Amino acid sequence: EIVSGAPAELSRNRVVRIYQQAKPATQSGEYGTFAWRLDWDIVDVANRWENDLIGWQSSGDYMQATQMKFTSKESAIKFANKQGWDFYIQEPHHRKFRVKQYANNFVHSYGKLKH
C-alpha cells in the first residue's frame, strides 16, 4: 500500500478514531446514533495554542476539524485501511431493556414511600 492522493505523512504518524457518536444526555433525541465518525486526534504539540494579538485559537493541525459521516463500521474500517492509516475503533453502548409498568405505585409492608 502506497497512498495515491494523500500528500501528507498522515498515514504513518497519527492515530485516528472510528466511533459511534454518543447519545447526548441533555436532549432526548437520537440522531447522532445513526452515523459513524472518523476523527483525527489532537495528540500534538500543535494542538490548538492561544494567539497573543487578538486571542483567537490559531491551531497548527492542518486537519483539526474534520469529520466523515459513514454508514457502517465495517465500511468505515474498510475505508480506513484502504486509504491506510492507523485507527482505533470504539464500540458504542446501548440502553438496556427494563420493563416499565407505569403501575409501580403499590406496596406491601415496607418503610420507604415515594411520590
Binding site: 407505569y102 405505585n105 403499590f106
Partner: protein, 443 residues
C-alpha cells in the same frame, strides 16, 4: 307511558327519618341478614337487572363497574380490598349531600355495607368534603351509632364480614372529586390523579385494589336490594332507569331540590315543582342541565327534549350530575361561563400540561369576551383551542373545562358579536410603558 311526579311511595324521605329508630321505621336495616348471607353474585345480578346508571358523571352502568371489581384472581392473597365513597360533591349546582348526607345517612351506612358485601371489601372509606365540618360531625356520630350498636363492624347484622367505615375529609379540591385524585388524596399525597390504563379495579387503591362510588349511587343500594330490580327498571327509558335527584337553582322562581323521575319534560320539571322561571317560560336565556360541565341548551330545544341521559346525550348534553341551573333572559351567559373559566382555574390540578395553560388561556379569552375586546375570528380561534383540550388530559377535568365553551359557540353568537360591537379597534393601539396601557382585563 309518559313520565310523572314520581309517586310519593319513593326511595328517600328527609323529613321524619333522621334517627337510628325512625330510619328503621322507614324501612332500613330491615332484611340485612338475608342480604349479606345471600351471595354477592345475587347482588350483581339484582343490580344488573336494576339498570342503575352511575350518578357520578360518567353515567355508567353500576353493575358493570361492580362486577369489574371482581376478577377470578381475587381469591388469591392479593391483600385487603376495600372501597371508597366519593362523598365530595364539588361541581357548581349539586346540592346532593345536604339532602343525603346531612339528612339521610343511615341509608348510606348500610349502602356501603351492602356494596362492600358485593365487593368482598374489607372496609370502606367515605370521603366527605372537609368543607362540610357541620355535616362531618353529624355523619361521624351517625356512623358511630351503628358502629357501637353492633350494626356495623365485625358482626354487621350477623355478618361473616368484618367491615369498617372510616370517614375522611376532602380539603377544598374539586379535582379530588375525580376518582383517581381521590385515591392519591387517600394515599396522603397531593390531590393529583394517575393516568387511566392501570384501571383502579386492580391497580392498588391505597395499595390494594378498590373502587370508587358516588354517594347517591350507593345510597339507593340497600333500598334497591330490598325492593326488586324491576322497581327501578319501571321508570325512565329502556336503558336509563329509575328516579334521580334534581337540584334546581339559578335564576328561577323557587330554588329547590327534589328526587324525581328520569326522562321528564324539563318544562314540567320547572313549572310543577320549583315555581317556574323567574319571569316565566318566555324569560329564560339558557339552561345549564346536569353538570356544571355540560353545554347550554337554547330556549327552543330546552322545551321538549327529556331529562334523561341518552336522548340528551343525543342533544350533546351529558347530564352526569342532574343539577339544573336556569338563567333569566336579563342576565349575562358570558359572566356565567367566565365564572366557570375561573372555576376551572381554581380547580385544575397541575399534572396535565394542557389543562393548566388551557384554562389560563380560556380565562384570558373570556375576559376579552366579557369586555368586548375580541375580534370575530377569535370566537372560532377560541373554539379551536377548546378542541385542543377536548381529549388530551389525564382525567376528565380538562374535558369538563372544555364543555362549556363548546356549548357557548353552539346555539349562540348573536351576543358575542353584540358585545364585540360595543367598541371599535380590537387589540387596541397601546404602548406598555412599565405596565400595559389603554385597556386591561381582570387583575
Amino acid at each position: 307511558g309518559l313520565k310523572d311526579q314520581d309517586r310519593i311511595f319513593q326511595n328517600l324521605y328527609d323529613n321524619y327519618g333522621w334517627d337510628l329508630a325512625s330510619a328503621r321505621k322507614q324501612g332500613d336495616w330491615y332484611k340485612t341478614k338475608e342480604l349479606i348471607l345471600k351471595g354477592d353474585t345475587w347482588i350483581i345480578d339484582e343490580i344488573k337487572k336494576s339498570g342503575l346508571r352511575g350518578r357520578g358523571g360518567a353515567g355508567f352502568p353500576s353493575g358493570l363497574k361492580w362486577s369489574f371489581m371482581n376478577p377470578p384472581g381475587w381469591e388469591k392473597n392479593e391483600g385487603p380490598r376495600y372501597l371508597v365513597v366519593n362523598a365530595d360533591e364539588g361541581e357548581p349546582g349539586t346540592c346532593k349531600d345536604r339532602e343525603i348526607m346531612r339528612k339521610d345517612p343511615h341509608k348510606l351506612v348500610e349502602g356501603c355495607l351492602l356494596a362492600g358485601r358485593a365487593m368482598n371489601a374489607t372496609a370502606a372509606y367515605i370521603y366527605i368534603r372537609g368543607e362540610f365540618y357541620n355535616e362531618a360531625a353529624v355523619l361521624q356520630t351517625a356512623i358511630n351509632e351503628a358502629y357501637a350498636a353492633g350494626l356495623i363492624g365485625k358482626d354487621a347484622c350477623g355478618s361473616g364480614y368484618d367491615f369498617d367505615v372510616y370517614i375522611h375529609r376532602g380539603m377544598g379540591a374539586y379535582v379530588c372529586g375525580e376518582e383517581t385524585s381521590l385515591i392519591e388524596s387517600l394515599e396522603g399525597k397531593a390531590g393529583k390523579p394517575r393516568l387511566k390504563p392501570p384501571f383502579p379495579a386492580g391497580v392498588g387503591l391505597f395499595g390494594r385494589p378498590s373502587t370508587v362510588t358516588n354517594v347517591e349511587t350507593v345510597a339507593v343500594a340497600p333500598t334497591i336490594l330490598r325492593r326488586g330490580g324491576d322497581w327501578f327498571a319501571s321508570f325512565g327509558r329502556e336503558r336509563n332507569s329509575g328516579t334521580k335527584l334534581f337540584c334546581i337553582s339559578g335564576n328561577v322562581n323557587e330554588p329547590c331540590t327534589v328526587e324525581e323521575e328520569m326522562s321528564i319534560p324539563l318544562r314540567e320539571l320547572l313549572e310543577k315543582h320549583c315555581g317556574g322561571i323567574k319571569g316565566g317560560w318566555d324569560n329564560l336565556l339558557g339552561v345549564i342541565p346536569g353538570g356544571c360541565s355540560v353545554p347550554i341548551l337554547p330556549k327552543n330545544i330546552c322545551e321538549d327534549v327529556l331529562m334523561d341521559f341518552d336522548a340528551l346525550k343525543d342533544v350533546q348534553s351529558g347530564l352526569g350530575t342532574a343539577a339544573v341551573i336556569v338563567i333569566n333572559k336579563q342576565q349575562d351567559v358570558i359572566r356565567a361561563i367566565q365564572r366557570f373559566a375561573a372555576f376551572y382555574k381554581h380547580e385544575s390540578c397541575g399534572q396535565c400540561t394542557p389543562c393548566r395553560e388551557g384554562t389560563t388561556w380560556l380565562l384570558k379569552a373570556m375576559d376579552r369576551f366579557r369586555t368586548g375586546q375580541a375580534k370575530e375570528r377569535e370566537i372560532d380561534m377560541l373554539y379551536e383551542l377548546t378542541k385542543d383540550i377536548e381529549g388530551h388530559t389525564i382525567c376528565a377535568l380538562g374535558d369538563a373545562a372544555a364543555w362549556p365553551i363548546q356549548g357557548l359557540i353552539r346555539n349562540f353568537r348573536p351576543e358575542m358579536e353584540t358585545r364585540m360591537k360595543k367598541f371599535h379597534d380590537e387589540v387596541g393601539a397601546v404602548s406598555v410603558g412599565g405596565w400595559m396601557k389603554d385597556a386591561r382585563v381582570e387583575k
